[PDB]
Design a binder for these strands. Structure first.
Lengths: 134, 104, 48, 206, 49, 219, 167
RNA sequence: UGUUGUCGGCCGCGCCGGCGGCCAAAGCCCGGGGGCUCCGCGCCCCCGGCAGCCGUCGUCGGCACGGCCGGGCGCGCCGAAAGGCGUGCCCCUCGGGGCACUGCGCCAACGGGCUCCCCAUCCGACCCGUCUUGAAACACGGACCA
RNA sequence: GGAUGAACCGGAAGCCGGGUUACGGUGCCCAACUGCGCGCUAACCUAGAACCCACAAAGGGUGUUGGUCGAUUAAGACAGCA
RNA sequence: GCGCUGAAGCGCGCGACCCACACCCGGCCAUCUGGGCGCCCCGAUGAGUAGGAGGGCGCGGCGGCCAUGCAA
């Protein structure tokens, strides 16, 4: 792909790498067809030439031109978009992150136990199949 | 682009070989036992099973056997699981090539 | 103290850690050769 | 980043559909050198970037070369897409040494599907084509579009491709119709699912 | 080294701004530097006179 | 650098104190250094040799320094170790050897009829409340006198002391079985209860001796 | 900004010289560079180019940089420029859309390299000139960006923006 | 005789933090003026208070690992352990700090070589000797050995 | 290191061991990136310091990108049709 | 070489890596610095044809010393 490149606001974007070490961003100022200023509420602004930083589906409700206070206000209005963000499209990383945190005792018993039950569910599910089948 | 999903993959990373056991009379094959210094994360051993360890056979550096043999095995299984791991090598190694730093 | 140097007599430096940027080039082009106050102190702290 | 096709201790099935021939061959040669036993499937559906005439001249300089100069015995040229892929592997591997020849002999390339490897074939980490001919980005050529202009094995291969595709479409259509039924009674029994104290901390780790 | 620069701030006031935002560079005065050296021989003795 | 600054900053300072206690007693440690010591028969030769004393004393100290410290990095007690899981009560094992971390040898006695011993990559071990000064080294496999029963009754007292903590603590009892299942291991949570030791350690110390020398083994 | 592109170095100086009533008189010529290493060198090209001096008959008083000047923010820089290709150096007057002074060099080095072909030995430019947005004359990328600032057109090409994933 | 834990030295590694350099400053909130665009938005610039934190030089501060090689410390008491327990000075005058004050001696655990072949890898360009500026040499000399 | 290679580059070597590098290189063969930001090319140009060894000229090219200057424009252009 | 093409080409920047016998480091061989008691030690440089200069190995018979031999 040459892709989305531009020049507009409201469109959240998600990272294809850099320093930071973060990161999700939305584009505040738009400043030809390569260069753009991306910022976030609790993330640092950067002006990048950013072909290879790709923009996600979920879009946040703001109009064109954002200084800092305005951006904050927009974020407050939205939020919700971050949840979609924790989950899903780009976005994903809070559900994944929930994954990484887990090779650890308390964490390992919570797991055998999800498992143990999962089994009980397989068994109920299987019984159901048998009644349905014939 | 690359559509970063990804996974991570990083070269790091050093480790040392503990010692390589070449045994027969005729039932067993060969073992190598490996220690990475700290590295792979409990998650990153676990998610994986499947480390390639590639160690360069580099002059190290008296006059060494500098040959165009870079050897890369695979890590079979933890035995050590939060540290040390078992490994095997498929060509078979250089001389007593125990010791030398292991890398990916 | 121009004759306190009169050292004893050459420093035997380690090859630099992580290398040069290339040897065939001067300071202007991002190379190593030539005069440079900053980068000598970088280079000697690589040559440990 | 992690290469998501690559190592398995034993597998090895590769999908060649709209993959890039030299990119797929490069990973396959590395899996073969590692001691894997590699089966590339759908060799007819694999892609090479570049404009048809210029791909056609490369192979054609081999085709005038097929004729002459003559004992017999090789230099030799394979008409057909698996065997073109095999010719590509026998340049990718160091092709004068027992370790390389033993790696070559662990490859098979099969056209369509062999009779059934119904364990799915898997895609190589972005080997695949769409973009790598870029939108536009001029032409690409399929190996089954090259080998129609070079000959059988191809021709039988694309006729057997057709039948194996038509029957496995029919068999897929109905297995999907039962799988959807199984999914719907499975999801309702996760919507229901009895209770917890331990059990719902796991779906708070999706 | 701070005092060598330091008179150059303390008297001066023409040096920083105009200078960011405009070209040429200033009249007045300058402070000197010294300074001794170290030499390490990067290139070997093969093919030089 | 942060540990290593502290050592400097006399020099010696306690070692300037040490002399003093001898100076205080009264008047001394030139005479006693010169006048002493033993000698004179013997047989043969150069007498090039040796040991006990003064170097050996830094080498034991020196060897003591990883030893806390590797536990600060990895957390726990030391050896002696209990099956948490398996049998509700049951019995006690000591880590005599690492093939590795993970592959471990867990121990006991056998002099008449005996007792096994396992090498495992796991099966069943989480640690207790005791520390020694080894890491995880001794072995081959030795012990014996009363001690299928004693080591074991030492087990019962720890298994009671543990079983109560396993009731108070766990997530429950079923993956204390997964923790016991693991056995590399290790970091997360370590120190619960089981108070005190004084016997537990005395017992562990004997176990180390028993998996050492000199019994049953000599020809 | 992160791993440079060319911060302009304000060198004030001298020319320190002789027992004759002469002496050299004052300069900046304000040069874009990566820190002192480029300066030293930059002066010998300025001193060879304008005045002829020596190396020694340039003495340098002080250096001041510029620290984020632009605050990230913008202009489409008019550059008066020299590229060496199939002979010596040819003049060019390039006015192009950019971020900043960090970016302008690269877009020139890449356009002098591709567009103009330039290979290593080359030295830089003559000047870089801010201009106003409505004013920017010639041509393609910048004209569109000028239009984007207008607006309507911040909010045009969202019209691919928000049109990859879908609405 | 073989192995494994370690204390000491050497080098490598990644990460974190502070201060000064660019009189510090992006900055933001407050307050005042100018310009462009004169279709208005929006853009810009300058000055004072002020959350704030930045990319780079220099420097210092804190940790954790590996590889290789080898085996300064005590001399009364308590303290498993590490550690403190003699006294004077001074800064801070808080926690504490540095500074000063005889001689002598000198580790743990456990129970092989070589020949030919095969596979990997390189020399590889024979060797070898000679001739030659240059030898594998399609330059010369040898069947092989005693 | 340069596919091979007396004299190009790195480099001047007792033997060994380990560490880091130089030149040069990092898709596979082949250790190590299918590295980052950007831009040009679609001819398989093209994977090339140097070499008897790697050719390509005078001259031409509305291919394509890019820079600039003059004039003409809603006091309606350029072209086409009428 | 396989052979790529929004690059595995090209150019402008850049990050991390790889890689010698080099350079460091450890231990050791000559000469020389010298030192110290026929012997020990500290550090440096230390490829090699023609070739000079010097120490040593082996052959055969002779002499003085000193043995070995029914299994040389």
């Amino acid at each position: 792909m040459p892709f989305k490149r531009f020049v507009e606001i409201g469109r959240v974007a998600l990272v294809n790498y850099g320093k930071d070490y973060g990161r999700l961003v939305v584009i505040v100022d738009v400043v030809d067809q390569n260069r753009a200023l991306v910022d976030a509420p609790d993330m640092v602004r950067c002006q990048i030439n950013f072909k290879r930083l790709s923009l996600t589906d979920i879009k946040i409700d703001i109009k064109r031109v954002p200084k800092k206070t305005t951006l904050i206000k927009a974020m407050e209005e939205a939020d919700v978009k971050n949840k979609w963000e924790n989950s899903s499209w780009g976005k994903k990383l809070i559900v994944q992150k929930r994954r990484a945190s887990l090779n650890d005792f308390d964490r390992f018993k919570v797991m055998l136990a999800k498992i143990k039950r999962g089994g009980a569910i397989r068994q109920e599910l299987a019984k159901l199949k048998k009644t349905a089948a014939a | 682009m690359k559509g970063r999903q990804g996974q991570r993959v990083r070269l790091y990373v050093r480790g040392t070989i503990l010692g390589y056991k070449r045994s027969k009379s005729n039932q067993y094959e060969n073992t190598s036992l490996l220690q990475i210094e700290g590295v792979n994360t409990k998650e990153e051993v676990g998610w994986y099973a499947g480390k390639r360890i590639a160690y360069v056979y580099k002059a190290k550096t008296k006059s060494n056997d500098s040959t165009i043999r870079c050897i890369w095995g695979k890590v079979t299984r933890p035995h050590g699981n939060s540290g040390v791991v078992r490994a095997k090598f498929r060509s078979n190694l250089p001389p007593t090539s125990m010791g030398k730093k292991v890398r990916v | 103290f121009k004759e306190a140097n009169n050292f004893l007599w050459p420093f035997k430096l380690k090859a630099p850690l992580g290398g040069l940027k290339k040897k065939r080039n001067h300071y202007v082009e991002g190379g190593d050769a030539g005069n440079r106050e900053n980068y000598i102190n970088q280079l000697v702290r690589r040559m440990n | 980043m992690v290469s998501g096709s690559g190592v398995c201790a034993k597998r090895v099935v590769v999908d060649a559909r709209h993959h890039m021939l030299g990119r797929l061959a490069s990973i396959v040669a590395k899996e073969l050198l590692n001691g894997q036993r590699v089966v590339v499937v759908r060799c007819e559906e694999i892609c090479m970037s570049g404009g048809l005439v210029r791909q056609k001249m490369k192979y054609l300089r081999f085709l005038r070369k097929r004729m002459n100069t003559k004992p017999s015995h090789g230099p030799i040229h394979f008409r057909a897409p698996a065997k073109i892929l095999w010719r590509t592997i026998r340049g990718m591997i160091p092709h004068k040494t027992a370790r390389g020849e033993a790696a070559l002999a662990r490859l098979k390339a099969y056209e369509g599907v062999p009779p059934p490897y119904d364990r799915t074939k898997r895609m190589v980490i972005p080997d695949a084509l769409k973009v790598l001919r870029l939108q536009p980005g001029h032409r690409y050529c399929l190996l089954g579009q090259l080998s129609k202009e070079v000959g059988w094995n191809y021709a039988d291969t694309i006729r057997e491709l057709e039948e194996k595709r038509k029957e496995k479409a029919k068999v897929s259509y109905d297995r999907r119709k039962q799988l959807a039924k199984l999914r719907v009674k499975a999801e309702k029994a996760a919507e229901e699912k009895l209770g917890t104290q331990l059990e719902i901390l796991a779906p708070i780790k999706y | 080294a701070e005092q060598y620069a330091g008179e150059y701030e303390a008297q001066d006031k023409e040096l920083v701004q105009l200078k960011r935002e405009a070209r040429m560079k200033g009249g007045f005065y300058v402070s000197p530097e010294a300074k001794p050296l170290f030499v390490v021989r990067i290139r070997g003795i093969n093919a030089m006179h | 650098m942060a540990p290593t600054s502290k050592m400097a900053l006399g020099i010696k300072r306690a070692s300037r104190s040490h002399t003093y206690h001898r100076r205080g007693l009264w008047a001394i440690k030139a005479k006693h250094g010169g006048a002493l010591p033993k000698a004179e028969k013997p047989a043969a030769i150069a007498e090039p040799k040796f040991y006990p004393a003064d170097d050996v004393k830094p080498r034991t100290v020196s060897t003591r320094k990883p030893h806390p410290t590797k536990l600060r990095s990895t957390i726990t007690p030391g050896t002696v170790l209990i099956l948490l899981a398996g049998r509700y009560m049951g019995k006690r094992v000591v880590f005599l050897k690492q093939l590795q971390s993970g592959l471990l040898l867990i121990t006991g006695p056998f002099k008449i009829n005996g007792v096994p011993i396992r090498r495992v990559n796991q099966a069943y071990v989480i640690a207790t409340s005791t520390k020694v000064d080894i890491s995880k080294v001794n072995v081959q496999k030795f012990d014996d006198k009363y001690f299928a029963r004693e080591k074991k009754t030492r087990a019962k007292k720890t298994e009671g002391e543990l079983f109560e903590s396993d009731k108070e603590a766990t997530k429950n009892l079923p993956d204390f079985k997964k923790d016991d299942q693991k056995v590399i291991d290790a970091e997360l949570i370590k120190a619960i209860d089981a108070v005190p030791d004084l016997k537990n350690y005395l017992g562990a110390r004997f176990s180390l001796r028993d998996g050492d020398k000199p019994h049953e083994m000599t020809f | 900004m992160g791993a440079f592109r060319f911060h302009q170095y304000q060198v004030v100086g001298r020319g320190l010289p002789t027992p004759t009533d002469e002496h050299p008189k004052i300069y900046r010529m304000k040069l874009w560079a990566t820190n002192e290493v480029r300066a030293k060198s930059k002066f010998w090209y300025f001193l060879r180019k304008l005045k002829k001096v020596k190396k020694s008959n340039g003495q340098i008083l002080a250096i001041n940089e510029i620290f984020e000047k632009n605050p990230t923010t913008i202009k489409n820089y008019g550059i008066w420029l020299r590229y060496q290709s199939r002979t010596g150096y040819h003049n060019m007057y390039k006015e192009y859309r950019d971020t900043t002074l960090n970016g302008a060099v690269e877009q020139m080095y890449t356009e002098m390299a591709s567009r103009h072909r330039v290979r290593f030995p080359c030295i830089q430019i003559i000047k870089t000139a801010t201009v106003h947005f409505k004013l920017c004359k010639r041509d393609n990328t910048k004209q569109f960006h000028k239009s984007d600032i207008k607006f309507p057109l911040v909010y045009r090409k969202v019209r691919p923006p928000t049109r990859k994933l879908k609405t």
